[PDB]
Amino acid sequence: GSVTHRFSTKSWLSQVCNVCQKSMIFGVKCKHCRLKCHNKCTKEAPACR
Ligand SMILES: [Zn+2]
Ligand SMILES: [Zn+2]
């Protein structure tokens, strides 16, 4: 079928990117593995195991 995980958007308030970690509120939820990362930051964040 497809091994592509679907990401979602989230922005609480006091949350920080789990990749570059900076002043902002950007987060993405990856299923199959369950991870959090900037709106994208794919260049920094690793590959969804
Ligand atoms: Zn980031
Ligand atoms: Zn995943």
Side-chain angles (χ1 to χ4, degrees), residues 12-39:
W12 290 277
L13 217 85
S14 290
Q15 202 54 251
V16 182
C17 182
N18 260 59
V19 195
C20 61
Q21 50 175 249
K22 282 205 217 301
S23 178
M24 35 249 293
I25 292 97
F26 265 117
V28 299
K29 213 152 70 216
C30 110
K31 255 53 68 77
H32 305 265
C33 339
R34 314 305 202 282
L35 196 51
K36 69 201 65 159
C37 331
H38 240 114
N39 217 18

